[PDB]
Symmetry: C3
């Protein structure tokens, strides 16, 4: 079970489209306007305690990606307890409108290793 908190009543619970979907839909908590060739940190008003040995990759919705919208950053650490921001980059030709409640990205919980690092002289 992954515990999550809405910071304000503008936050929508992250949802999964289907039982075989890779990620959990993230929603914009506020209204944003993104000019062509600009980028914008979008607040979700969702904070969460991630599961152990993984991280949340904020990944792009495919439809938005064909409109020219990409993702910046997107690394949500296992110990990040703050507001989750989606960095949207408008690489399209037109101003991109974000309304409160718009599906803006997907959060994928990606399993990872935390290995020890040891310096040697030859591999």
């Amino acid at each position: 079970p992954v515990r999550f908190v809405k910071e304000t009543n503008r936050a929508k619970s992250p949802t999964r489209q289907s039982p075989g979907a890779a990620g959990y839909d993230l929603y914009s908590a506020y209204d944003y306007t993104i000019p062509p060739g600009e980028r914008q940190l979008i607040k979700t008003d969702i904070s969460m305690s991630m599961p152990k040995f993984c991280y949340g990759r904020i990944a792009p919705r495919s439809g938005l990606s064909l409109k020219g919208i990409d993702i910046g950053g997107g690394v949500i650490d296992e110990d990040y307890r703050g507001n989750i921001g989606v960095i949207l980059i408008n690489n399209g030709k037109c101003t991109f409108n974000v309304n409160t409640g718009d599906r803006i990205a997907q959060l994928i919980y990606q399993r990872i290793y935390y290995p020890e690092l040891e310096e040697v002289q030859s591999l």
Copy 2:
């Protein structure tokens, strides 16, 4: 064992370079012209049933990345049964030519979690 279909004869089986290569090579099944500052959906004519508790990341080739070619979207869900498409972004200064058979990207089967979500008030 991942099962895949060649939708048309122009589809080419994804292959790994080496036993230590992260990704399977995706090939273009058609011929494309992509001008500077534009993107294009490339059809592979491949569809596949992904391994359970995982997804397919369409990741960039290092070669094309240095020439300013990037990858959009890239999330290939576990329950996806359609044609796998690749979003090539041309951020370089010259028209990038896509020939039938050209390696364009690499599918990576990334291990993930599907946790249940529960709403709480404090973390």
Copy 3:
């Protein structure tokens, strides 16, 4: 335990901040000047033997992401025994400077699969 090798005394050992961090900080080994709209390969002068059944992802730092600095390529294969290079993309407005010892990205050891493929008729 993942072994690594410094190619020069200009390379800096990758670092961990906290138990819940995603990955390991990668540092520049040389001085670079990246003009707006350009990408530049950044040598870390670090070679390592990646652990089995995974790959290192050169992942963006959010601080830079917001300034307009994006990652290109970024797939470090299991059997890569060469110099790890970070492709930094200046999609910002000003020129981006990189001094030796600058925190440029993070490395994430993402768990992956190597399934055998099998062509079929139906799915």
